[PDB]
Amino acid sequence: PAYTNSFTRGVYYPDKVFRSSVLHS
Amino acid sequence: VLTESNKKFLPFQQFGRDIADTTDAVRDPQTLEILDITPCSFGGVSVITP
Ligand SMILES: *[C@@H]1O[C@H](CO)[C@@H](O)[C@H](O)[C@H]1NC(C)=O
Ligand SMILES: *[C@@H]1O[C@H](CO)[C@@H](O)[C@H](O)[C@H]1NC(C)=O
Numbered sequence: 001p002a003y004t005n006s007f008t009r010g011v012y013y014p015d016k017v018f019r020s021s022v023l024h025s
Numbered sequence: 026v027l028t029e030s031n032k033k034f035l036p037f038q039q040f041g042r043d044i045a046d047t048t049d050a051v052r053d054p055q056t057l058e059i060l061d062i063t064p065c066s067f068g069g070v071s072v073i074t075p
Contacts, residue, residue, distance in 0.1 A: 013037075016037055016038050016039050017038065017039070017040060017041065017042050018032070018034050018035065018038040018039075018040065018041040018042075018043075018050065019041065019042060019043055020032070020041075020043055021043075022043055022044070
């Protein structure tokens, strides 16, 4: 029990691709 | 055309897809160097006559 909020955790690099100053979805 | 580059990749990254998902920089698997990629040449021909 004792559930906890996870605000903005759990994000990783999906691909081995270099990107600079660009917004990608 | 393969040329030298100044961009610094992350240690785990291999190539770049910055604009329009087009490859323009590729890490060399042997020397661990980043090389820029650019198409060599293309264009039209115009003739000027009096
Ligand atoms: C966790 O779940 C409970 C119900 O299962 C809910 O009441 C609670 O608001 C949830 N936690 C957060 C941070 O929203
Ligand atoms: C690959 O082998 C060459 C020749 O032995 C060496 O100069 C180079 O550093 C090696 N590269 C890696 C990533 O081990």
